[PDB]
Amino acid sequence: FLELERSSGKLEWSAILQKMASDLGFSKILFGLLPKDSQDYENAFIVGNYPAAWREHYDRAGYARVDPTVSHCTQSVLPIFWEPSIYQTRKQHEFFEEASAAGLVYGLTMPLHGARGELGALSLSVEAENRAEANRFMESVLPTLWMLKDYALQSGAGLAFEH
Template sequence: MTDLSLFESLLNCNTVEELHTNTTAIIGQMGFEHFLYGVQVNTSLTRPYRFILSCYPEAWRKHYDEEGYAGIDPTVAHCARTTIPIIWKNEVFKGRKEARVRSEAKDSGLVSGASFSVHGGRGEAAMLSLATSRESREAQDDILATMGRAQLLTCYLHEAVQRIVLSQGPLPLKQISLTERERECLLWAAEGKTGWEIANIVSISERTVTFHLQNAAQKMGVVNRQQAISRALSMGLIAPCTIT
């Protein structure tokens, strides 16, 4: 079976358990022993939705969460801001706290590895880390040789998670589509304008402004104007300078 066929098999999975089993098998064929996929969906600016699929050692996962290492781990920060992969080199973990994360990860069997990211069109950001217990020049060469395949795996895995997990919960199966007037009203509402002020700016009645804002909120599954603004911004449905 070719690499592409392997990756495409993820799209045929119907459960999280099946996806976990298939991903574990694929990363094993690529020379890795452990993987962790995580995605954050900004359905709320204060309480974003997170989903993790992992075959990392449970003791390390628990320790990592208890210590709040996600806020220290430089690979997490890197993948949040760029789609360029990052190899776990010592110079990446150059601070004292970062070096501690690296050292303790090695003690847990996550010795060599790399992290990959993908950013979806609906505001979600995902990251896949692949790790092995090997620490050698050969292990680093193997990681370099598989970077392209690993990035492709990240994309296919994210697509599978969207269908199995995200479309059933925080993200709708279909892309939300706001009308031009709904986006316009939301943008001015985000600027703090009242319904009356928006009506005067866009030359419609205040009742019509309320109608458009309610329609937008209903499409996004929220109940009020503030939530609609937050959801639209976090999902990339509105953005600065989209009014012409």
């Protein structure tokens, strides 16, 4: 958090957050944030290293309104693990297949709810060999991730919306 706060500009903050994620064992991350009373998902503040073509398609196709992790974030402060049980409807299943082709198979999303009403998500994806190991690994680092998401929120909200 101290490095994140000493950092200047989005490239540096993004680089620090991405390295924190990678050092913890997660090769892909997304931090997304909106100001209070905005549902403008396609124009959120977005940081991270999701493949660019996936990000562009996701926004163009309005996947924020289909992706079950986003609806979850609007309702909860608790993590959502990317298990098959969350990809229930045909459209969510098709979304899962496309996300999988983009390299996003195993992971979790931590909802973000800031002190000024900011709404966001911190997602991390892990390239584990199988689902069981992905889950054992994520559980083992979950307390660290839980702290990380609040530090990223407090710092990122300042970068996204403060002058």
